[PDB]
Amino acid sequence: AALVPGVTQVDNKSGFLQKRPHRQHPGILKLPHVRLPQALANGAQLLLLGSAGPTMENQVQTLTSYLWSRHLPVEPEELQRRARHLEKKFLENPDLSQTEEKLRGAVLHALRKTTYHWQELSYTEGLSLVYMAARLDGGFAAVSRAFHEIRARNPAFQPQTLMDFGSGTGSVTWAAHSIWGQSLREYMCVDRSAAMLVLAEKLLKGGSESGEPYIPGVFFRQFLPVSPKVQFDVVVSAFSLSELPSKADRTEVVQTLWRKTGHFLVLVENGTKAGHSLLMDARDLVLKGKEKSPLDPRPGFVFAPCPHELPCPQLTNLACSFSQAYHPIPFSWNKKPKEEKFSMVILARGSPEEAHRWPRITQPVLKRPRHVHCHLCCPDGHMQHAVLTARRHGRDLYRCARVSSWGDLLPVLT
Amino acid sequence: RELPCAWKPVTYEEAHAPHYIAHRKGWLSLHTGNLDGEDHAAERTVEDVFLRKFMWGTFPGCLADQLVLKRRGNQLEICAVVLRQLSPHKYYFLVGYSETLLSYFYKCPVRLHLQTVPSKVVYKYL
Amino acid sequence: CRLPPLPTIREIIKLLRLQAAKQLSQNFLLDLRLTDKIVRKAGNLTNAYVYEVGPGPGGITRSILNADVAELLVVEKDTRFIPGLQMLSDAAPGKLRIVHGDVLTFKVEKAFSESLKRPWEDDPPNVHIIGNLPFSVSTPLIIKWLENISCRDGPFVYGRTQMT
RNA sequence: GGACCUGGCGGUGCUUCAUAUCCCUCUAGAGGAGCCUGUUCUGUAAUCGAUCACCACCUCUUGCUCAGCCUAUAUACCGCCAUCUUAACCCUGAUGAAGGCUACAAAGUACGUUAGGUCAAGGUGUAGCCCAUGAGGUGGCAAGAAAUGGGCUACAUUUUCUACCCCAGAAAACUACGAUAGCCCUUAUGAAACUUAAGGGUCGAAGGUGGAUUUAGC
Numbered sequence: 001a002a003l004v005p006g007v008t009q010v011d012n013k014s015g016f017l018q019k020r021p022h023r024q025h026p027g028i029l030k031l032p033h034v035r036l037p038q039a040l041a042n043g044a045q046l047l048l049l050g051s052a053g054p055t056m057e058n059q060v061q062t063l064t065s066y067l068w069s070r071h072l073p074v075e076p077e078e079l080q081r082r083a084r085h086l087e088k089k090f091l092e093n094p095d096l097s098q099t100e101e102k103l104r105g106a107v108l109h110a111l112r113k114t115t116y117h118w119q120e121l122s123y124t125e126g127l128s129l130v131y132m133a134a135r136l137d138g139g140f141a142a143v144s145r146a147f148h149e150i151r152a153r154n155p156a157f158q159p160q161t162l163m164d165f166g167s168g169t170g171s172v173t174w175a176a177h178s179i180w181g182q183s184l185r186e187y188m189c190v191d192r193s194a195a196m197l198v199l200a201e202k203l204l205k206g207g208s209e210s211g212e213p214y215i216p217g218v219f220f221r222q223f224l225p226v227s228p229k230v231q232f233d234v235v236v237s238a239f240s241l242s243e244l245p246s247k248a249d250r251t252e253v254v255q256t257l258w259r260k261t262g263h264f265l266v267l268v269e270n271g272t273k274a275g276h277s278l279l280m281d282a283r284d285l286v287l288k289g290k291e292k293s294p295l296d297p298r299p300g301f302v303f304a305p306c307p308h309e310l311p312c313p314q315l316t317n318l319a320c321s322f323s324q325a326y327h328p329i330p331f332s333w334n335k336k337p338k339e340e341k342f343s344m345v346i347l348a349r350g351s352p353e354e355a356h357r358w359p360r361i362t363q364p365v366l367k368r369p370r371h372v373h374c375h376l377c378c379p380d381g382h383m384q385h386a387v388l389t390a391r392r393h394g395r396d397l398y399r400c401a402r403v404s405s406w407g408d409l410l411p412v413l414t
Numbered sequence: 415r416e417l418p419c420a421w422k423p424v425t426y427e428e429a430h431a432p433h434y435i436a437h438r439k440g441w442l443s444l445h446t447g448n449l450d451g452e453d454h455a456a457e458r459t460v461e462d463v464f465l466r467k468f469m470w471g472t473f474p475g476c477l478a479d480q481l482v483l484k485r486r487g488n489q490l491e492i493c494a495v496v497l498r499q500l501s502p503h504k505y506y507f508l509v510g511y512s513e514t515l516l517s518y519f520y521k522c523p524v525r526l527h528l529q530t531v532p533s534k535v536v537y538k539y540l
Numbered sequence: 541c542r543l544p545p546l547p548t549i550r551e552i553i554k555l556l557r558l559q560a561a562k563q564l565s566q567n568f569l570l571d572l573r574l575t576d577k578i579v580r581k582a583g584n585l586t587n588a589y590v591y592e593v594g595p596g597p598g599g600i601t602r603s604i605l606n607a608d609v610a611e612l613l614v615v616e617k618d619t620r621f622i623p624g625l626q627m628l629s630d631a632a633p634g635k636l637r638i639v640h641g642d643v644l645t646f647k648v649e650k651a652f653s654e655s656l657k658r659p660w661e662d663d664p665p666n667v668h669i670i671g672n673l674p675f676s677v678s679t680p681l682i683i684k685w686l687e688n689i690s691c692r693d694g695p696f697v698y699g700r701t702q703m704t
Numbered sequence: 705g706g707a708c709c710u711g712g713c714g715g716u717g718c719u720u721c722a723u724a725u726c727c728c729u730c731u732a733g734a735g736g737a738g739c740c741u742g743u744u745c746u747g748u749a750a751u752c753g754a755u756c757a758c759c760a761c762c763u764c765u766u767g768c769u770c771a772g773c774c775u776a777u778a779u780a781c782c783g784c785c786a787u788c789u790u791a792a793c794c795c796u797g798a799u800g801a802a803g804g805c806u807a808c809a810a811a812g813u814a815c816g817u818u819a820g821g822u823c824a825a826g827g828u829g830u831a832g833c834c835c836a837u838g839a840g841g842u843g844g845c846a847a848g849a850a851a852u853g854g855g856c857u858a859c860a861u862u863u864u865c866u867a868c869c870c871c872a873g874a875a876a877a878c879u880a881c882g883a884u885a886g887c888c889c890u891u892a893u894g895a896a897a898c899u900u901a902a903g904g905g906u907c908g909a910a911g912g913u914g915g916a917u918u919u920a921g922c
């Protein structure tokens with residue numbers, strides 16, 4: 001509990017209260033509506049000029065819904081447990097107490113239900129175009145929010161090396177140039193699908209197979225470089241680890257990315273239970289280092305969004321996601337601004353900068369007459385459902401909560 | 415064990431779709447309210463909804479197929495299709511009960527026309 | 541020292557604007573391990589001044605740069621690899637001097653400082669030439685450099701410069 | 705190691721063409737005004753937010769009634785929607801992998817899922833504050849500018865007014881055309897009309913045909 005009525009008070013460092021209004025209190029991390037660069041927008045529209053009819057709207061909606069509702073691959077352990085349970089249940093039933101071979105077939109038939117069919121998506125040129133038109137803006141917005149976290153809290157950071165695993169459309173590269181464009185000199189992009197590499201190159205050349213790149217220093221690769229010697233300043237993986245077919249692949253990929261991380265490792269996934277579980281698996285992997293004597297001996301910690309390194313309090317049943325609003329790319333079906341729901345985790349080398357860490361709001365703040373509802377993940381490792389009022393917590397605390405929003409930090413001490 | 419190893423009867427009413435109501439199906443409720451110039455359509459609809467809920471709750475698991483609610487004058491005829499699972503004495507008890515209760519709730523001479531079938535009369539498998 | 545990745549074959553094809561693997565008309569050593577073997581066979585280059593020729597993608601360039609050379613002079617004839625070599629130069633500040641021109645015609649006697657010129661009778665004068673060039677141009681160069689040794693001019697104004 | 709079989713080539717190029725959408729052509733509009741929207745930036749102690757809400761100040765107190773609260777929770781169920789998953793026979797090759805057609809015919813025939821939304825209480829619960837998430841009062845708060853995204857009137861002569869419903873008379877580019885622009889007043893409906901709608905008067909603004917692109921069509 002980071003909020004005890006009457007005890008906890010605002011942390012006034014740099015005199016923000018006296019020298020600044022409350023809407024610009026340090027814990028504000030809200031990003032305005034995200035608009036894509038004109039270059040990327042024109043390139044995407046030019047590349048989809050060939051075929052942007054009614055079929056494309058249906059395909060985009062279907063693909064987006066399929067990606068959003070897709071579950072993690074079911075490992076053999078849970079399938080074995082389910083099979084044993086259903087086998088016992090069928091043995092109990094006199095009608096279904098058939099022979100073993102017949103029984104096993106019925107259990108398999110019922111397991112075809114109550115389980116998710118995970119299928120690898122083979123992204124060809126057509127499916128690459130559909131995924132582009134369906135997720136370019138959303139990925140850009142999510143990655144922009146993730147990077148804005150780092151800047152807003154650490155504006156002295158001037159990266160020179162970026163790597164992107166599962167770089168499908170170049171969204172991470174575009175955001176990184178839009179943000180740290182004056183210090184980055186190389187953009188390593190990795191993708192097993194050749195069609196996406198071609199599409200990203202074409203987009204970077206203004207939607208034309210021949211042109212001059214908007215962003216200099218981009219490298220495109222199909223295989224993940226595996227070597228601890230080459231260490232990047234920032235490593236990013238956006239909506240990529242969910243494509244891997246098994247937990248072992250996620251384990252090895254996350255270990256490699258952490259080994260090749262210099263300052264920051266950013267993981268971004270859909271804001272569902274599956275993505276949250278995947279990101280917590282990656283978090284527990286990185287935090288609980290198992291390498292006996294790695295080349296880089298620096299420790300790691302969670303820079304965002306968690307104010308602690310304990311197991312997540314929401315991983316039992318619930319999730320933890322954030323929202324970023326953005327202006328969708330102009331199309332025959334994109335009119336109104338949208339909201340992207342995504343889960344994120346940033347792991348940084350070294351140790352926490354100070355001990356005055358602040359709670360994170362993990363849910364929309366609800367404003368009501370003379371009180372505010374905030375769901376706060378405390379640095380002690382617990383959630384707190386807080387109703388802030390001026391009389392109980394103080395005028396400054398109440399006003400700071402009044403101006404705060406989803407994904408902000410509440411500046412409290414003791 | 416591992417993933418690649420792994421990798422409904424309907425009655426005539428149920429089988430046909432809503433775009434066949436005047437082509438293959440008919441209307442379960444039949445009354446003059448919806449005709450041009452006639453009034454009290456909403457009252458008839460509310461009465462119909464209550465009738466269906468009550469009849470399904472007073473004959474649980476007995477109704478094989480949907481009710482047919484007919485209206486002639488102030489008469490109210492509930493032509494129902496039920497099963498032969500319940501005892502006939504209980505059927506007679508419930509028939510008298512429902513007739514009297516609905517007659518006194520709607521202030522009209524209600525009447526009930528059970529038709530028992532051995533089992534659900536399936537048309538297709540969807 | 542953090543260096544950019546070695547270009548792959550596909551990047552080379554796109555850089556040469558060939559769009560195919562059949563009009564390459566060149567052979568590239570894109571294994572840093574063999575290049576490190578070569579530079580190992582070139583001797584001990586610590587605090588040495590190297591004059592490299594025919595870098596191309598730059599595997600030999602990277603291998604020499606990992607060794608603690610004092611300054612590495614590159615002569616490249618293609619403008620299309622100068623961007624990659626400039627990125628390498630940015631990665632290693634002050635140890636890479638890229639020059640556009642022919643290796644048959646470049647004048648090395650002015651390239652390095654005059655304090656390295658050691659007498660002929662002494663040991664090799666702390667300057668080294670390393671080269672993985674096309675076989676159609678490596679023979680005129682060795683003939684020319686043999687003539688220079690006979691006259692003790694050109695790259696051998698510094699003394700008995702070793703070649704690899 | 706020799707010979708052979710099925711292949712796959714997520715294959716690579718060329719000649720022909722059906723080559724429909726999309727091009728081009730044709731026509732029709734629109735794109736430049738004056739209404740709105742959504743965003744951003746700037747600025748506010750505060751919200752250009754639907755009496756209520758917000759900001760700055762104060763007051764009340766066991767009170768209304770063992771009070772009171774349009775508070776949270778469907779991330780409690782239920783339900784209403786929405787997302788995703790759910791062959792046989794007969795011949796040939798020595799009875800090898802394997803293969804099987806000729807028409808004036810030569811073996812071929814047959815329910816679960818969801819940090820989903822929706823209590824702008826469909827219902828049943830669960831928690832919150834209860835000298836303040838309750839009840840009052842006094843002031844203030846009724847922002848400013850671009851942009852880009854798109855639903856919105858005419859620019860006049862094949863025009864406008866009158867008669868008429870197609871054989872008429874006038875006016876015509878500065879007393880020309882045009883406003884669903886502004887202001888005032890009447891009527892309608894309602895307890896209530898700056899609120900909403902309609903009519904009359906006032907007014908007679910831009911507009912002078914708008915390129916790239918670009919919107920439609922059989």
Ligand SMILES: C[S@@+](CC[C@H](N)C(=O)[O-])C[C@H]1O[C@@H](n2cnc3c(N)ncnc32)[C@H](O)[C@@H]1O
Pocket residue numbers: 123135139165166167168169170171172190191192193196222223224237238239240243244
């Ligand atoms: C669908 S994209 C996700 C969006 C993308 N990260 C972005 O920035 O918008 C993920 C990509 O990762 C690539 N990928 C999946 N598994 C991989 C693997 N094992 N090795 C290399 N790339 C892989 C796929 O080709 C896929 O295109």
Ligand code: SF4
Pocket residue numbers: 305306307311312313314320360362377
């Ligand atoms: S901030 Fe807290 S609730 Fe959210 S993901 Fe991190 S540990 Fe979990």
Ligand SMILES: [Mg+2]
Pocket residue numbers: 846
């Ligand atoms: Mg107001």
